Amino acid sequence: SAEVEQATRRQVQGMQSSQQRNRERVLTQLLGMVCDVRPQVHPNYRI
Template identity: 35%
Template sequence: MTSQSQGIQQLLQAEKRAKDKLEEAKKRKGKRLKQAKEEATAEIDHYRLQREKEFRNKETNVMGSQGNLSSKIEEQTTEAIRNLTSSYHRNMESMMKKLLSTICDISPEIHPNFRPAV
């Protein structure tokens, strides 16, 4: 009977060791999964930051060129206004003289198709 109880004791101890090993394996697996998840999160964050940086660079290039376009358009508009103003001042007096002479200098004439009533 003692050999039976020793056998049972050995089986119980073997079962306990197997449970301990199983628990330890589960803990290691959980630890590895947690570590893999953290590494994946870090890699995702790194990738996200890299893509955002590239996006900002592209956005800056596009917006910068739009800023350049708006400044060029504004510069061209200012130049056109300056040219029109100078042209107006150069030609205003001669145009006013022509307009006044056309309105005020009337030379009455009989129309060539006019037939006096007899």
């Protein structure tokens, strides 16, 4: 059973390392997209 827990920890560490590489860039895109509102009237409005 030790080999399975050992591999699991290594996979989590890998995920942690990968997401760190661009963590701020991914957050930056999300923050930018949410901040840009882009209001729009429903396309079926007819007046």
